[PDB]
Amino acid sequence: SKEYHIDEEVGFALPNPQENLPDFYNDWMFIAKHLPDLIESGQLRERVEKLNMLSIDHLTDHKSQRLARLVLGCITMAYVWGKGHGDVRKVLPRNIAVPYCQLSKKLELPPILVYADCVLANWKKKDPNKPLTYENMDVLFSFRDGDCSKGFFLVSLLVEIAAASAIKVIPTVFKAMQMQERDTLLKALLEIASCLEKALQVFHQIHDHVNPKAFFSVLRIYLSGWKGNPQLSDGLVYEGFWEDPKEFAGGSAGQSSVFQCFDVLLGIQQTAGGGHAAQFLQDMRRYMPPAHRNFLCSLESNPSVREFVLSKGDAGLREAYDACVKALVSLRSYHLQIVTKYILIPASQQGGTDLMNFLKTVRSTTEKSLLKEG
């Protein structure tokens, strides 16, 4: 690990995100910081239409470009979805479409709000001298009062951070395989397994800070994109940048690099085959930051832990390897239950089976990677 932009303490998330942009962009940040009130009063759309076209030249360093991608992506969701009741904008105005697209191509991400914007760069500690717990943290932007974006974003972030403790171990895994250092490889695999077990505890916080009706009827609407979306059949037009409408996927934790990297690490071939699930997870790698995508490619080019463990006729190693797969299955089983409570039951009024089918395919693939199981 070196220039993969992966942090010791926080992993794939952006370390200590910038909260303020240069004063040259106070007109962007007034809108982003007040979307609850501006959306509800119906003045957001006119306020975005009335901004001038601001250059991206004053965004000098990485952290300010990431805040700007966050700021404009939030304004774009609000502009396109309005008050999230089904009356949508097919055109994004030039004054915000051009700088958003220019900044996006600079950072090699699509001009739509992605996971690495609203989770990995969308947080702050309340008091720097205290640890990274939900109580000492907060998001930087929200769409609507009571949309539960703080719970949803922050709990995803804390899971991402939990798993980041196991990322540190990955160089130990490959150095041990290369040097045939068997004892330290088994220690490495169980260390990876206990971090993934700790991350499962973090998942329980979702029930405390997100409620299903707000998630389903509100936050879901603002996280949606325009790829195969019937509300914008042809996609969104980026006035002044592409003449024709263009389709980009809405936010999806397939764009989280941390579960994709453990799939790669353990040889669970989630992107193998022609199926829709593999097709989808591969395409979501284009919505990850290039440093993290390059990291995934880098693990896929290392020797297979899985084939190393199978070739050695060593139970101890096989149990440690299964301890990691079991942790992943446990995570994905608990998360399928979240989705039953937060999407399936609300959708029937306390599409949906396409999502459940997707997650069960991923979990199935994972389950079938267990070794002396069957």
Ligand code: HEM
């Ligand atoms: C209210 C809570 C949640 C709901 C309703 C929910 C729902 C979903 C749905 C419907 C998908 C598949 C659709 C898609 O990604 O396009 C998905 C994928 C995924 N989600 Fe969540 N999720 C929630 C919480 C979380 C949290 C806190 C994490 C922590 C990082 C997470 C991690 C993932 C991952 C890694 C995937 C990719 C598929 C996989 O690796 O199994 N989810 N989620």
Ligand SMILES: O=C(C[C@H]1c2c(F)cccc2-c2cncn21)C1CCCCC1
């Ligand atoms: O996958 C996602 C959203 C995605 C997401 C974000 F877009 C931003 C922050 C966290 C997540 C997240 C966590 N699990 C799925 N997702 C939606 C897909 C459509 C049904 C609602 C859930």
